[PDB]
Amino acid sequence: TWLSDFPQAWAETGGMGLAVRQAPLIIPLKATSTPVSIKQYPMSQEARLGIKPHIQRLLDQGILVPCQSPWNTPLLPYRPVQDLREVNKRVEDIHPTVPNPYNLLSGLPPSHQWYTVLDLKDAFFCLRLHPTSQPLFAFEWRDPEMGISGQLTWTRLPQGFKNSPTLFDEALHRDLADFRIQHPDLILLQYVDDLLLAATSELDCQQGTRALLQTLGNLGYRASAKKAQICQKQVKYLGYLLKEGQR
Amino acid sequence: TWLSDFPQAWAETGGMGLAVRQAPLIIPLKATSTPVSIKQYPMSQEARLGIKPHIQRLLDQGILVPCQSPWNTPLLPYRPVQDLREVNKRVEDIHPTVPNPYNLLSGLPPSHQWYTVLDLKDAFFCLRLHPTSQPLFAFEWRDPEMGISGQLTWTRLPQGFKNSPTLFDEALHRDLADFRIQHPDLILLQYVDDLLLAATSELDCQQGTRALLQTLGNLGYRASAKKAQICQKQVKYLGYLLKEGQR
DNA sequence: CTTG
DNA sequence: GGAAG
DNA sequence: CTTG
DNA sequence: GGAAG
């Protein structure tokens, strides 16, 4: 089956991803920015116990590390959500290169009606952050019944950061450039972590999907085996139902 | 003096005006209009005693007369103010021909710096209403301590009627047409009931003002002797101060 | 009085 | 709510 | 939690 | 006030 043939490509069997070909990202600040340190709002025990196993898993994975940083933004409550709005304001803008889904789907011709849809799991976390940029994203973590108060920060591209979708989309485009060159018959649409492969025949779509999964896993990305729509005539992609070249 | 030389022209000495050359006005209705009868809101004794001497004076002058009309609009409280909004909605629109004061003053050249300013008193009441149009403006009048409940209406162009300023301005323009032809040296600005005469010299402005007062009184209009600004180098007209050709 |  | 009729 |  | 981080 598809799960056994590509253990590296699926998040279920391949471990947390890491885009090994992508250099750790440096995040340039605006010309006048200085660090901002926002105090952590006290959070209830209920919220803290809910967040704690997530933080611990991220620490175990090396996605969070301890730090001391002049930057600090608050965590809110369960799973942690960081309010990065004051960091976002101080980070230099980049051109938005992610196409809107309407325009992205215009590149889907009627000759290609066999579809494979993959969604990458924990996509942003596959991209490393350069150590010089890690302090930007620090937050406070308290363990009252352990007695650890200090900051943690991210070693990977974080959720809530304004440039994460664009930086991820650009990174994956670099990493799939050769796949496109090696498979000029296939149509590959990329929308951040949502991928559509289109082919002429079931065999072609089958062979391309095998190549794409092999490529994604080798590069360090991980797709959701549970959500994958593999070699179907009808798929759901980006909120559309793709059927008979329609929509 | 100016008051003794032109007794007919001044409201103080000439009686209520009546534009004897102007035919009684017929007020056309919109194509779909039918009469509207709005109930008179009960008014306090204090308001009624305040309004009463005004109504009685207008009755004595023949400006109000008794009637029975399918139209009725309310009086509000002291001096009476009629709410003619529902009549105004049913009366056919006319082109607004009264110039705005800014544009009206553009016709004042610097060669004419001697001014006379007159304001006509009770101007609208100088224009008669045709008996066919009188019922349009009816209202209810109650005298509880006399025991008279019934309608009255206007025999002259009423306050609060949307076309009164334009109809009056057009009427006075017809009546002063010959004065303009007989005095081509003078500048005469008309803004409804507010008149400015301009001349080159004090003698000219003096002679023109004598002619204008004689003409106005003969036609049945009445100017306020108290407010008149006669043959001055500096006058207030339409909210402006006219001095040295400025403003 | 009702209709920024 | 105050400007208007 | 703050920021038609 | 609820959509966002």
Cα separation, B222 vs B123, in Å, equals 8
Residues A21 and A61 reside in one and the same domain: no
Residues A42 and A21 reside in one and the same domain: no
Task: Determine the nucleotide nearest to A83 by Cα–C1' distance.
Answer: F5
Residue B85 (CA) to nucleotide D4 (C1'), in angstroms, measures 9
Residues B42 and B111 reside in one and the same domain: no
Residues A226 and A208 reside in one and the same domain: yes
The end-to-end CA distance of chain A, in Å, is: 30
Task: Determine the nucleotide nearest to A77 by Cα–C1' distance.
Answer: E1
The two three-digit tokens of residue A32, written as one number = 């006048």
Contacts of A145 (CB under 8 A, 6+ apart): none
Burial class (CB in 10 A: 0-12, 13-18, 19+), B62: exposed
Asked if residues B137 and B37 have their Cβ atoms less than 8 Å apart, the reply is no
Contact flag, residue B83 CB and nucleic strand D, below 7 A? yes
Q: In the sheet that B187-191 helps form, which strands lie side by side, from edge to edge?
A: B187-191, B194-199, B114-119, B229-232
Residues B122 and B171 reside in one and the same domain: yes
Asked if residues A90 and A81 have their Cβ atoms less than 8 Å apart, the reply is no
Cα separation, A72 vs A70, in Å, equals 7
Nearest residue (Cα to C1') for C2?
B83
CB-contacted nucleotides of strand E (7 Å): 1-3
Q: How many CB atoms lie within 10 A of CB A212?
A: 22
Residues B82 and B36 reside in one and the same domain: yes
Task: Determine the nucleotide nearest to B85 by Cα–C1' distance.
Answer: D5
What secondary structure, in 3-state letters, does chain B show?
A: CHHHHCCCCEHHHHCCCCCCCCCCECCCECCCCCCCECCCCCCCHHHHHHHHHHHHHHHHCCCEEEECCCCECCEECCCCEECCHHHHCCECCCCCCCCCHHHHHHCCCCCCCEEEEEEECCCHHHCEECCCCHHHHCEEEEECCCCEEEEEEECECCCCCCCHHHHHHHHHHHHHHHHHHHCCCCEEEEECCEEEEEECCHHHHHHHHHHHHHHHHHHCCCECCCCCEEEECEEEECCEEEECCEC
Contact flag, residue B82 CB and nucleic strand D, below 7 A? yes
Asked if residues B19 and B128 have their Cβ atoms less than 8 Å apart, the reply is yes
Contacts of B107 (CB under 8 A, 6+ apart): B187, B189
Split into its structural domains, chain B has a count of 2
Show the domain range for B70: 29-90+135-156
Cα separation, B168 vs B176, in Å, equals 12
Cα separation, A104 vs A189, in Å, equals 7
Of A residues 63-82, those with CB within 7 angstroms of nucleic strand F are 76, 81-82
Cα separation, B97 vs A170, in Å, equals 67
Residue A109 (CA) to nucleotide C4 (C1'), in angstroms, measures 53
Residue B237 domain-assigned? Answer: yes
Residue B247 domain-assigned? Answer: no
Residue A148 (CA) to nucleotide F1 (C1'), in angstroms, measures 37
Task: Determine the nucleotide nearest to B41 by Cα–C1' distance.
Answer: C1
H/E element, A215: helix A202-219
Residues A188 and A237 reside in one and the same domain: yes
Task: Determine the nucleotide nearest to B160 by Cα–C1' distance.
Answer: D5
Rounding to the nearest 10 degrees, give the CA dihedral for residues A192, A241, A206, A106. Answer: -60
Backbone phi, psi, residue B48, to 5°: -65, -45
Nearest residue (Cα to C1') for C3?
B85
**Which technique was the structure solved with, according to the deposited record?**
X-ray
Task: Determine the nucleotide nearest to A73 by Cα–C1' distance.
Answer: F5
Cα separation, A242 vs A238, in Å, equals 10
Residue A247 domain-assigned? Answer: no
Nearest to A157 by CA among A221, A209, A201, A101: A221
* Amino acid identity, position B234: Q
Contact flag, residue A83 CB and nucleic strand E, below 7 A? yes
Residues B170 and B78 reside in one and the same domain: no
Burial A139-166 (b: 16+ CB within 10 A, else e): bbbeeeeeeeeebbbbbbbbeebbbbbe
A33-to-A40, A87, B71 alpha-carbon distances in Å: 21, 9, 74
Residues B22 and B118 reside in one and the same domain: yes
Angle at alpha carbon of residue B186, lines to B182 and B191, rounded to 5°: 100
Place of tokens 């017809």: B174
Residue A85 (CA) to nucleotide F3 (C1'), in angstroms, measures 14
